């Protein structure tokens, strides 16, 4: 089963700065990684699908990149609404798996 590693569990950034979340796959998985955002007391919200595909209704501030084993979810110019836990998930091999998550701290 594919293990997804989310580098630092917490990420500290200054207001408006650029932030990048890392998600490593225990093996090569193409671009079958999807990112979710979850605020306190909230349900997960799909931010990026297939590593870099944007989702309508989601700020253009968010973008994803990578392929193979290393994937990155970036937030250009972070703002308060962005404070949350970010998760990556893979659909390359069954069963689907999630990363442990990374908290954004401003």
């Amino acid at each position: 089963d594919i293990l997804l590693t989310q580098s630092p569990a917490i990420l500290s950034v200054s207001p408006g700065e650029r932030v990048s979340f890392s998600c490593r796959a225990s093996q090569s998985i193409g671009t079958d990684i999807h990112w979710y955002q979850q605020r306190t007391n909230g349900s997960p919200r799909l931010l990026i699908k297939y590593a870099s595909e944007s989702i309508s209704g989601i700020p253009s501030r968010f973008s994803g990149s990578g392929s193979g084993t290393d994937f990155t979810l970036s937030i250009n110019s972070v703002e308060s609404e962005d404070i949350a836990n970010y998760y990556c998930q893979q659909s390359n091999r069954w069963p689907f798996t999630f990363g442990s998550g990374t908290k954004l701290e401003i």
């Binding site: 079958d32 999807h34 349900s43 997960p44 799909l46 699908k49 297939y50 998930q89 659909s91 390359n92």
Partner: peptide, 18 residues
């Protein structure tokens, strides 16, 4: 416990409140 709907394309488009 959340439930989510997947269109068969690998990602969770929508989730419940749990």
């Amino acid at each position: 416990y959340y439930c989510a709907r997947e269109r068969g394309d690998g990602y969770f488009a929508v989730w419940g409140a749990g």
